């Protein structure tokens, strides 16, 4: 194992300075990552893997074997959120957050919308298979439940289907923050599900703060997505690009916001909307504390700007 380095993207989103307050290791907080699966014994990820599930072929399996990453993309994404702060490898935006790895993409990195919908349902239900055990309407942030608080989707397609949208709505109503990649075709607007109003569409910047030529336009926010070093199978590391690598930076930031808020106040913040510019919701905070690049204000390249954890957490707590 190589000595630990902090990848430029983790630096750029201002995560390291948040770690004295929280690294996301608040018990009620889980991040669900719907992707190719995970190298579940990777030394730099294992301790943060709380649940491994697969929805491939409409069959829900928690057999490790069926949940393992056979592509690598998922392992990389997960590493960007939650690689462990230690002496090896890399480090995530939220290096102590619990991860739910929900495998909705197969070896080829392609997936059915049906499987992905099922995947969102599983992030909501949690290991116990029940959304709201005690029946009080609180799901995300309810310590009595095991739902994830963040759903991270580094994937997309061109189709807008009603059942998948209805499941997205269910997640939002459960109080879950939904984050997705804008797409990698240099298109005028985001793929689905990033283009739904309930979801945070994320574009990719490179290391000189320019927007990637491949990044689908009109995102909500943007994040490091070119030359991003992270964990990769088997028990190794690799450097990749895409709006897929940006997405987890944002999910990490959200995790830290919700974790810091719950730690101080024993509650989480509402999810919020796109137009939100208050300090009273997750998305509002993300928007007002984003590094505003390009033209003043929201713009078609960067969205509201580059997410900044240090500032988002300060705004949440104050």
């Amino acid at each position: 194992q190589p000595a630990q380095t902090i990848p430029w993207g983790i630096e750029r989103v201002k995560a390291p300075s948040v770690w004295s307050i929280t690294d996301g290791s608040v018990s009620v907080i889980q991040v669900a990552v719907l992707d190719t699966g995970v190298d579940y014994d990777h030394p730099d990820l294992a301790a943060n893997i709380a649940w491994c599930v697969s929805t491939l072929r409409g069959k829900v399996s928690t057999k490790l074997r069926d949940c393992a990453d056979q592509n690598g993309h998922g392992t990389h994404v997960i590493g960007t959120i939650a690689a462990l702060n230690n002496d090896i490898g890399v480090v995530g935006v939220a290096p102590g957050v619990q991860i739910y790895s929900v495998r909705v993409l197969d070896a080829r990195g392609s997936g059915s919308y049906s499987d992905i919908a099922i995947g969102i349902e599983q992030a909501i239900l949690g290991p116990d298979g029940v959304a709201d055990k005690d029946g009080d309407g609180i799901i995300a942030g309810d310590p009595d439940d095991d739902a994830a608080e963040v759903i991270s989707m580094s994937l997309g397609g061109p189709a807008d289907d009603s059942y998948l949208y209805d499941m997205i709505i269910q997640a939002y109503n459960a109080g879950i923050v939904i984050v997705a990649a804008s797409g990698n075709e240099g298109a005028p607007s985001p793929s689905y599900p990033a283009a739904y109003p309930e979801v945070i569409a994320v574009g990719a910047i490179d290391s000189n703060d320019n927007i990637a030529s491949f990044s689908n336009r009109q995102p909500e926010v943007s994040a490091p997505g070119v030359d991003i070093l992270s964990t990769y199978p088997d028990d190794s590391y690799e450097t990749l690009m895409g709006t897929a690598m940006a997405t987890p930076h944002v999910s990490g930031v959200v995790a830290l916001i919700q974790a810091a808020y719950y730690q101080k106040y024993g509650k989480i913040l509402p999810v919020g909307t796109f137009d939100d510019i208050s300090k009273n919701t997750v998305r509002g905070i993300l928007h007002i504390t984003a590094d505003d690049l390009g033209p003043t204000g929201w713009d078609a390249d960067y969205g509201y700007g580059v997410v900044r954890a240090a500032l988002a957490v300060q705004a949440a707590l104050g």
Binding site: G58, G109, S110, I116, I118, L125, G157, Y163, A244
Partner: protein, 65 residues
């Protein structure tokens, strides 16, 4: 056979109805009124004809980004 996802009216739907048109249930959602089903390609019209079926959608493809 194709895989499709049907949006259903729970007041008229029963998973056992699918077998009648040659199909089988793959997954019943717990949180929305929809079912994933496999059916013969020439059975799509019959599903549509079912009073419990409000919408039939094809299973689309997403890719890693």
């Amino acid at each position: 056979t194709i895989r499709v996802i049907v949006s259903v009216d729970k007041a008229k739907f029963n998973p056992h109805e699918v077998l009648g048109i040659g199909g089988h249930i793959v997954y019943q959602f717990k949180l929305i009124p929809a079912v994933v089903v496999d059916v013969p390609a020439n059975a799509v019209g019959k599903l549509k004809k079912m009073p419990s079926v409000e919408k039939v959608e094809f299973d689309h493809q997403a890719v890693l980004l």
